[PDB]
Write an enzyme that holds these catalytic residues in place. Structure first.
Site, PDB file in Angstrom:
ATOM      1  N   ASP A  67       7.182  -3.969   3.402  1.00  0.00           N
ATOM      2  CA  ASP A  67       6.038  -4.030   2.483  1.00  0.00           C
ATOM      3  C   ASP A  67       4.846  -4.705   3.189  1.00  0.00           C
ATOM      4  O   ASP A  67       5.030  -5.673   3.956  1.00  0.00           O
ATOM      5  CB  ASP A  67       6.335  -4.941   1.274  1.00  0.00           C
ATOM      6  CG  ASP A  67       7.633  -4.589   0.547  1.00  0.00           C
ATOM      7  OD1 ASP A  67       8.594  -4.085   1.160  1.00  0.00           O
ATOM      8  OD2 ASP A  67       7.695  -4.824  -0.669  1.00  0.00           O
ATOM      9  N   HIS A  69       1.523  -4.704   1.007  1.00  0.00           N
ATOM     10  CA  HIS A  69       0.856  -5.287  -0.177  1.00  0.00           C
ATOM     11  C   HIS A  69      -0.629  -5.691  -0.012  1.00  0.00           C
ATOM     12  O   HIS A  69      -1.056  -6.808  -0.426  1.00  0.00           O
ATOM     13  CB  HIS A  69       1.706  -6.388  -0.814  1.00  0.00           C
ATOM     14  CG  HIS A  69       2.903  -5.852  -1.524  1.00  0.00           C
ATOM     15  ND1 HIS A  69       2.786  -5.001  -2.597  1.00  0.00           N
ATOM     16  CD2 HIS A  69       4.225  -6.051  -1.333  1.00  0.00           C
ATOM     17  CE1 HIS A  69       3.989  -4.663  -3.021  1.00  0.00           C
ATOM     18  NE2 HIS A  69       4.886  -5.296  -2.278  1.00  0.00           N
ATOM     19  N   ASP A  96       5.350   0.244  -0.400  1.00  0.00           N
ATOM     20  CA  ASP A  96       4.646  -0.909  -0.922  1.00  0.00           C
ATOM     21  C   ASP A  96       3.483  -1.354  -0.054  1.00  0.00           C
ATOM     22  O   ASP A  96       3.415  -2.516   0.314  1.00  0.00           O
ATOM     23  CB  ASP A  96       5.617  -2.051  -1.209  1.00  0.00           C
ATOM     24  CG  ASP A  96       6.350  -1.877  -2.514  1.00  0.00           C
ATOM     25  OD1 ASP A  96       6.374  -0.751  -3.069  1.00  0.00           O
ATOM     26  OD2 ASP A  96       7.036  -2.856  -2.918  1.00  0.00           O
ATOM     27  N   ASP A  99      -1.101  -2.935  -4.040  1.00  0.00           N
ATOM     28  CA  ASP A  99      -0.859  -3.867  -5.155  1.00  0.00           C
ATOM     29  C   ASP A  99      -0.609  -5.286  -4.612  1.00  0.00           C
ATOM     30  O   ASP A  99      -0.181  -5.432  -3.461  1.00  0.00           O
ATOM     31  CB  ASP A  99       0.344  -3.445  -6.007  1.00  0.00           C
ATOM     32  CG  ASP A  99       0.012  -2.345  -7.009  1.00  0.00           C
ATOM     33  OD1 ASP A  99      -1.186  -2.123  -7.278  1.00  0.00           O
ATOM     34  OD2 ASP A  99       0.969  -1.676  -7.496  1.00  0.00           O
ATOM     35  N   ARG A 100      -0.888  -6.302  -5.427  1.00  0.00           N
ATOM     36  CA  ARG A 100      -0.660  -7.718  -5.114  1.00  0.00           C
ATOM     37  C   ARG A 100      -1.764  -8.326  -4.235  1.00  0.00           C
ATOM     38  O   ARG A 100      -2.498  -9.227  -4.680  1.00  0.00           O
ATOM     39  CB  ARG A 100       0.747  -8.001  -4.553  1.00  0.00           C
ATOM     40  CG  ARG A 100       1.951  -7.615  -5.465  1.00  0.00           C
ATOM     41  CD  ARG A 100       1.721  -8.081  -6.897  1.00  0.00           C
ATOM     42  NE  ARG A 100       2.911  -8.645  -7.522  1.00  0.00           N
ATOM     43  CZ  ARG A 100       3.870  -7.917  -8.075  1.00  0.00           C
ATOM     44  NH1 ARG A 100       3.782  -6.599  -8.048  1.00  0.00           N
ATOM     45  NH2 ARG A 100       4.922  -8.500  -8.648  1.00  0.00           N
ATOM     46  N   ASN A 128       8.207   1.356  -4.548  1.00  0.00           N
ATOM     47  CA  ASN A 128       8.071   1.298  -5.999  1.00  0.00           C
ATOM     48  C   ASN A 128       6.630   1.065  -6.456  1.00  0.00           C
ATOM     49  O   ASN A 128       6.275   1.407  -7.593  1.00  0.00           O
ATOM     50  CB  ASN A 128       9.068   0.329  -6.704  1.00  0.00           C
ATOM     51  CG  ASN A 128       8.903  -1.112  -6.292  1.00  0.00           C
ATOM     52  OD1 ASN A 128       8.803  -1.391  -5.118  1.00  0.00           O
ATOM     53  ND2 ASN A 128       8.900  -2.050  -7.275  1.00  0.00           N
ATOM     54  N   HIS A 129       5.803   0.481  -5.574  1.00  0.00           N
ATOM     55  CA  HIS A 129       4.397   0.321  -5.871  1.00  0.00           C
ATOM     56  C   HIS A 129       3.494   1.539  -5.651  1.00  0.00           C
ATOM     57  O   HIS A 129       2.318   1.532  -6.097  1.00  0.00           O
ATOM     58  CB  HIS A 129       3.825  -0.950  -5.212  1.00  0.00           C
ATOM     59  CG  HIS A 129       4.189  -2.202  -5.955  1.00  0.00           C
ATOM     60  ND1 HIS A 129       3.363  -2.771  -6.904  1.00  0.00           N
ATOM     61  CD2 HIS A 129       5.317  -2.951  -5.937  1.00  0.00           C
ATOM     62  CE1 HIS A 129       3.941  -3.851  -7.395  1.00  0.00           C
ATOM     63  NE2 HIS A 129       5.125  -3.988  -6.816  1.00  0.00           N
ATOM     64  N   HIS A 177      12.805   2.551   0.882  1.00  0.00           N
ATOM     65  CA  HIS A 177      12.136   1.302   0.438  1.00  0.00           C
ATOM     66  C   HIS A 177      13.128   0.365  -0.274  1.00  0.00           C
ATOM     67  O   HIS A 177      13.215  -0.872   0.013  1.00  0.00           O
ATOM     68  CB  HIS A 177      10.980   1.597  -0.528  1.00  0.00           C
ATOM     69  CG  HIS A 177      10.303   0.343  -1.028  1.00  0.00           C
ATOM     70  ND1 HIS A 177       9.526  -0.442  -0.213  1.00  0.00           N
ATOM     71  CD2 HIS A 177      10.388  -0.314  -2.206  1.00  0.00           C
ATOM     72  CE1 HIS A 177       9.085  -1.502  -0.895  1.00  0.00           C
ATOM     73  NE2 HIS A 177       9.626  -1.467  -2.092  1.00  0.00           N
ATOM     74  N   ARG A 225      15.876  -6.568 -12.297  1.00  0.00           N
ATOM     75  CA  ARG A 225      14.556  -5.970 -12.398  1.00  0.00           C
ATOM     76  C   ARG A 225      14.336  -5.159 -13.675  1.00  0.00           C
ATOM     77  O   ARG A 225      13.196  -4.912 -14.029  1.00  0.00           O
ATOM     78  CB  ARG A 225      14.231  -5.087 -11.181  1.00  0.00           C
ATOM     79  CG  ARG A 225      14.230  -5.870  -9.856  1.00  0.00           C
ATOM     80  CD  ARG A 225      13.905  -4.894  -8.746  1.00  0.00           C
ATOM     81  NE  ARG A 225      14.059  -5.437  -7.403  1.00  0.00           N
ATOM     82  CZ  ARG A 225      13.029  -5.837  -6.662  1.00  0.00           C
ATOM     83  NH1 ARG A 225      11.779  -5.826  -7.151  1.00  0.00           N
ATOM     84  NH2 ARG A 225      13.251  -6.252  -5.440  1.00  0.00           N
ATOM     85  N   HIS A 252      11.451  -4.271   0.197  1.00  0.00           N
ATOM     86  CA  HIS A 252      11.492  -4.422  -1.272  1.00  0.00           C
ATOM     87  C   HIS A 252      11.862  -5.840  -1.777  1.00  0.00           C
ATOM     88  O   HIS A 252      11.876  -6.106  -2.992  1.00  0.00           O
ATOM     89  CB  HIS A 252      12.499  -3.369  -1.824  1.00  0.00           C
ATOM     90  CG  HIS A 252      12.555  -3.267  -3.328  1.00  0.00           C
ATOM     91  ND1 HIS A 252      11.437  -3.021  -4.117  1.00  0.00           N
ATOM     92  CD2 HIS A 252      13.627  -3.151  -4.155  1.00  0.00           C
ATOM     93  CE1 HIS A 252      11.825  -2.832  -5.371  1.00  0.00           C
ATOM     94  NE2 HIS A 252      13.148  -2.920  -5.420  1.00  0.00           N
TER      95      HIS A 252
HETATM   96  O1  ENL Z   1       9.049  -4.800  -3.596  1.00  0.00           O
HETATM   97  C1  ENL Z   1       9.219  -5.582  -4.576  1.00  0.00           C
HETATM   98  O2  ENL Z   1       9.416  -5.165  -5.740  1.00  0.00           O
HETATM   99  C2  ENL Z   1       9.077  -7.068  -4.378  1.00  0.00           C
HETATM  100  C3  ENL Z   1       7.649  -7.433  -4.799  1.00  0.00           C
HETATM  101  C4  ENL Z   1       6.862  -6.257  -5.318  1.00  0.00           C
HETATM  102  O3  ENL Z   1       6.567  -5.341  -4.545  1.00  0.00           O
HETATM  103  O4  ENL Z   1       6.454  -6.242  -6.506  1.00  0.00           O
HETATM  104  C5  ENL Z   1       7.030  -7.944  -3.511  1.00  0.00           C
HETATM  105  C6  ENL Z   1       7.652  -9.332  -3.322  1.00  0.00           C
HETATM  106  C7  ENL Z   1       9.045  -8.978  -2.778  1.00  0.00           C
HETATM  107  C8  ENL Z   1       9.044  -7.445  -2.914  1.00  0.00           C
HETATM  108  O5  ENL Z   1       7.702  -7.128  -2.554  1.00  0.00           O
HETATM  109 MN    MN Z   2       9.309  -2.773  -3.665  1.00  0.00          MN
HETATM  110 MN    MN Z   3       6.975  -5.053  -2.602  1.00  0.00          MN
END
Ligand code: ENL
Ligand code: MN
Ligand code: MN
Length: 309
Positions: A67, A69, A96, A99-100, A128-129, A177, A225, A252
């Site tokens: 990821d 982010h 990913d 986001d964030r 997933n993002h 992922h 989750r 992830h």
């Molecule tokens: O991927 C994820 O769901 C987790 C979070 C996210 O993507 O929302 C982020 C923190 C750890 C992982 O990366």
């Molecule tokens: Mn993820």
């Molecule tokens: Mn993530």
């Protein structure tokens, strides 16, 4: 507008260097240029299998990142540490991207630019993002509307649907992922046959690939989750043995050291967003693999300064 311009409608290596400096200095890529990258990368992605199969010859390497982010300055750091992507420096970014973090637009268009520039050697997998639901809540929709328009966001959402869900190297290493499945008996061929150009469903293989996590104990658990499951080393061992695989690499989850190796070697986590959300204090890592030796080599790094947003 004296910003980066495509040459004859196409990404070149000098456009990519100009784009990264432009973004470094907090400037925006013109909408017509962002639009051309999106329609062109949609076309490249729509031709890929849901499972990308990649052969690495004995002397070839690949780098696998987890990821990111929207941590664009950390992404630039990766490229400085490990070199720019190229035909002899291939990359896989394992979902990913957005986001964030506050520079999701900059990360994603830089990655899409390199996918256009080196399509056989630059690989993007869906996380997933890269989904509408998540983007509406966790910042990416908000960022794209502010810098561009809702219509641009709709186009990102459509490109994301074409992101392949997994990648297999030398028929031996499988990368995705999230992780493995809520049910036994899933094959590589089942993954290849997933019709992926959609938002993921609430359950089933496409959901698992983006959302599942390993657990230490044998069995499966309901995910904390709210979606998919946790899978034990027995799951991983069964899956690897049926599919003739050595291990999987997944992302992830945040890991203090930037990586983890679970399930006795069989389930590797790689995470590439150091000091995640400016709060976690974690290291990140990326992995090297080579054709002659697919055992993962981990490269740790730490967060670099970014503009105060
Ligand atoms: O991927 C994820 O769901 C987790 C979070 C996210 O993507 O929302 C982020 C923190 C750890 C992982 O990366
Ligand atoms: Mn993820
Ligand atoms: Mn993530």
């Amino acid at each position: 507008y004296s910003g980066p311009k495509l040459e004859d409608g196409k990404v070149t290596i000098s456009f990519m260097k100009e784009l990264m400096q432009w973004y470094k200095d907090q400037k925006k890529l013109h909408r017509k240029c962002a639009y051309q990258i999106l329609v062109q990368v949609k076309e490249v992605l729509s031709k890929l299998s849901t499972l990308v199969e990649t052969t690495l010859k004995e002397t070839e390497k690949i780098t696998v990142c987890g990821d990111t982010h929207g941590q664009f300055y950390d992404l630039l750091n990766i490229f400085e540490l490990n070199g720019l992507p190229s035909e002899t420096n291939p990359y896989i970014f394992n979902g990913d991207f957005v986001d964030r973090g506050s520079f999701s637009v900059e990360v994603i268009l830089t990655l899409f630019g390199f996918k256009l520039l080196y399509p056989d050697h630059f690989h993007l997998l869906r996380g997933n993002h890269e989904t509408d639901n998540m983007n509406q809540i966790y910042g990416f929709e908000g960022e794209v509307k502010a810098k561009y328009t809702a219509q641009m966001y709709e186009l990102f959402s459509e490109v994301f649907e074409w992101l392949p869900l997994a990648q297999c190297i030398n028929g031996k290493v499988l990368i995705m992922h999230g992780g493995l499945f809520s049910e036994d008996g899933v094959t590589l061929d089942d993954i290849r046959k997933i019709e992926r150009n959609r938002q993921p469903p609430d359950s089933g293989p496409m959901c698992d690939l983006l959302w599942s996590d390993p657990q230490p104990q044998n069995g499966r658990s309901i995910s904390k989750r709210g979606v998919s499951c946790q899978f034990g080393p027995d799951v991983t061992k069964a899956f690897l043995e049926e599919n003739n695989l050595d291990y999987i690499i997944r992302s992830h989850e945040v890991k203090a050291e930037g990586y983890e190796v679970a399930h006795g070697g069989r389930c590797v986590t790689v995470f590439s967003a150091p000091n995640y959300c400016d709060q976690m204090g974690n290291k990140a890592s990326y992995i090297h693999l080579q054709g002659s030796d697919l055992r993962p080599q981990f490269h740790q790094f730490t967060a670099v300064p970014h503009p105060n947003v």
